Amino acid sequence: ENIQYDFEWRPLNNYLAVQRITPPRLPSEALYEWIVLNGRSPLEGLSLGEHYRLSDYGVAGLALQSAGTVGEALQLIKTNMLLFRKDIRGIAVRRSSCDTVDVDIDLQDKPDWPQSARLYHANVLASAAYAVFRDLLLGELELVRLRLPERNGDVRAYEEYFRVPVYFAGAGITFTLPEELLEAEIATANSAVFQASLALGSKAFNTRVTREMGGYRQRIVALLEVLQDRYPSIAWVARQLKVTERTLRRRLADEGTNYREVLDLVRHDRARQLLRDERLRIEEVAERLGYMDTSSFRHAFRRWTGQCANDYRQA
């Protein structure tokens, strides 16, 4: 029983309301087609693209908003699991040796649509993607360049709209960004909301984003880092990643690790700052690192470094 919520339905109808137009698997798919095929100019696609709000992308959009950096937001975008994914064949992010990054949007074919409708369509996706970039990823900096699909036409109205150089060539859409943007902070970053929001995504979304973010080890490390002083069971972690414990163990084993080793890496790292703090007793360091008593911590710490905790604190 596959039932999807139709997030695109409202913004489509908002466009129709604004333009005073009356309309005759998801209901939005047929409506979108009708709007596109009845467009009187490809430029109208730019207006329709404006009607997609970040909130229209649902919990995936919340993850984007709360991501730590622009680079991390682009990892989520690369999963191709946002609104237009049926119409997008793939999204690539390519580093250049030219201090720029290309975000390439590859579009699915529309062989039954005429050439004007296909240009209209590309403008909708470009305008909507631009809105996301603008509100969230650009901030102060600007787009270097925008490439839209080849046609015989003037670029003026597009440079008017996007306020950056634009040209027509090839297939799909490419946004060129300054490379330094990737490490820039997202203004609404919130790592707790980000991790929580990923966990609310679908099984398929979770598998894909885990891959794009660097794999299961990295995913678990990021999750534990947000949980500043909690050390969850593998059961709880598997739940957050939308996988069974068995699957998680296996995928960790493929990356050549295991859950206990990942947990202890985070604990060891955290213990570095705790055993320098002169105000804490070893007892308090143990409790903070999730151990049930001091002796179990001492044995673990010994196992990590090969040195005793009190001797380490001095040296």
Numbering used by the authors: 5 to 28, 39 to 329
Sentences from the paper on this structure:
In this study, we present a novel AraC-family transcription factor, CdpR (PA2588), that controls numerous virulence factors via directly regulating the quorum sensing Pseudomonas quinolone signal (PQS) system. In this study, we showed that the new QS regulator CdpR (we named PA2588 in this study) directly activated PqsH, the PQS synthase. Like VqsM, CdpR belongs to the AraC-family transcriptional regulators, which control a variety of cellular processes in bacteria, including carbon metabolism, stress responses, and virulence. CdpR is a substrate of ATP-dependent ClpAP protease.
The structure belongs to P41212 space group, and it contains one PaCdpR protein molecule in the asymmetric unit. The overall structure of PaCdpR can be divided into three regions, i.e., NTR (aa 5–203), connector region (CR, aa 204–228), and C-terminal HTH domain (aa 229–329). The NTR is of PaCdpR that is of α/β fold in nature; it is composed of ten α-helices (α1 to α10) and five β-strands (β1 to β5). Four helices, α9, α10, α6, and α7 were packed against the β-sheet at the edge in an anti-clockwise direction, while α8 (the longest helices) crossed the β-sheet in the middle and formed extensive hydrophobic interactions with the three central strands (β2, β5, and β3). Though both CdpR NTR and EcAraC NTD are of α/β fold in nature, their overall folds are different from each other. Altogether, these data indicate that CdpR NTR has a novel fold among AraC family, and its functions need to be further investigated. Although the overall folds are similar, structural comparison revealed that the detailed conformation of CdpR HTH is different from other AraC proteins. CdpR HTH contains seven α helices (α13–α19), which can be further divided into two subdomains, i.e., HTH1 (aa 229–271) and HTH2 (aa 291–329). The largest difference occurs at the HTH1 motif, especially the helix α13. Instead, CdpR HTH1 and HTH2 mainly interact with each other through the backbone of loop B (aa 303–304) and the side chain of Tyr245 from loop A. This interaction was further enhanced by Arg281 and Arg284 of helice α16, which connects HTH1 and HTH2 and Tyr305 of loop B, via H-bonding and stacking.
